[PDB]
Design a protein around this ligand. Structure first.
Ligand SMILES: O=c1cc(O)n([C@@H]2O[C@H](COP(=O)(O)O)[C@@H](O)[C@H]2O)c(=O)[nH]1
Ligand SMILES: O=c1cc(O)n([C@@H]2O[C@H](COP(=O)(O)O)[C@@H](O)[C@H]2O)c(=O)[nH]1
Lengths: 217, 218
């Protein structure tokens, strides 16, 4: 997966006008957009096709899929029908729930990203202690795409170790949550950035600044 | 606590508006509380909540299993309550800050959070089950009043009821298709959630009536 500038925009603005304007302003720097529930629940699933029409970008649906297998299958089907290229799935609910997502992705020509450890402080309570095992589960299931935390580079490095160099790894928590752009890319193929860009006084300059800081990466 | 008619909540996971509306209307004499999840919302839009409210008397629980960082959780809850959901279901496994973010929005907006502790499917045994008692205790500490726990594991449902106390409100999926028993489930839960056993039936009204008849004394 060729992600331009190793930078994925987390487009969590909640109105269509702002989301489209800001994405347009940074389009020269980014060809992959992560669209999540803040935008989708505010503006509808049709927003995914609109992003493809306007920007011709890759779309990762960050839906943190975390239901039973039967419901997961339905969520993935609805998501891929809307034109998402990939979907993010939690590992904590177990292997059957992940497999349900893998099945639909194969059927529709899409990718599953397995979220293993999260970036926020609460992740330490339950998720972190399960995360290595969740990653091994991903490997056992044939998962090739993973999400791990910029905010804990030692944990991000461990995730990379488990999954190997061939697997694809993206990482949120850069900027607003404290993760460093350059350090994150020691381990992740691409980093996810939301507020540091979309809440910036000048989103284009913010994106440009981030890329300048990782220029030699 | 919410007064759920017949202690029975419809899990409306059909994925087109016409069928979802037909079936929900057919069971309206038996059920006044409907759980709407992502299968229907991602297929038809958040305006499906509006349509259900307009057409039927029903309370709406948005089963979105909110499982993000605090900042994103807040946004999800805001959008969901703006659309008219009475309540939203949130995962506990991402930890206390993520749950608190949802509680804060619910408090501000005059709505309710349901905390999902243990899940009903086989995969729940891998990671969730071992954390579930602590997730429930965390909910109690945070002041959560509404909970979700699994009908498929009566022993676990019973323990969750103990942890949250008799005053908390507990709803429970996994009845019917997943193997949970209607009566046994209501020994511990205030209300049972039923999806496929009703919405895939040739006569959803008869299916609902049959489930209720089997728990009439309760
Ligand atoms: O562990 C995780 C997994 C996520 O997908 N994300 C998400 O990635 C984004 C981070 O955005 P931001 O750069 O504004 O902190 C959000 O959309 C958020 O929901 C996260 O921050 N940490
Ligand atoms: O532990 C859980 C939590 C849930 O919300 N649910 C959900 O409750 C419903 C179960 O429906 P059904 O009766 O068709 O098995 C679904 O909407 C599903 O996503 C579950 O089955 N087990």
């Amino acid at each position: 997966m060729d992600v331009m500038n190793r930078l994925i925009l987390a487009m969590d603005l909640m109105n269509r006008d702002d989301a489209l304007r800001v994405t347009g302003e940074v389009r020269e720097y980014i060809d992959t957009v992560k669209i999540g529930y803040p935008l989708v629940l505010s503006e509808g699933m049709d927003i995914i096709a609109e992003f493809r029409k306007r920007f011709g970008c890759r779309i990762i649906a960050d839906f943190k899929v975390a239901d039973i297998p039967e419901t997961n299958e339905k969520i993935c089907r609805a998501t891929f029908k809307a034109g998402a290229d990939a979907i993010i799935v939690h590992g904590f609910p177990g292997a059957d729930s992940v497999r349900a997502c893998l099945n639909v992705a194969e059927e529709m020509g899409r990718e599953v990203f397995l979220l293993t450890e999260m970036s926020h402080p609460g992740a330490e309570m339950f998720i972190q202690g399960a995360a290595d095992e969740i990653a091994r589960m991903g490997v056992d299931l044939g998962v090739k795409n993973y999400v791990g935390p910029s905010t804990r580079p030692e944990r991000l490095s461990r995730l990379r170790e488990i999954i190997g160099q061939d697997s694809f790894l993206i990482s949120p928590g850069v900027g607003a949550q404290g993760g460093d752009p350059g350090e994150t890319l020691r381990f992740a193929d691409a980093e996810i950035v939301g507020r540091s860009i979309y809440l910036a006084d000048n989103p284009a300059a913010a994106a440009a600044g981030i890329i300048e800081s990782i220029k030699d990466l």
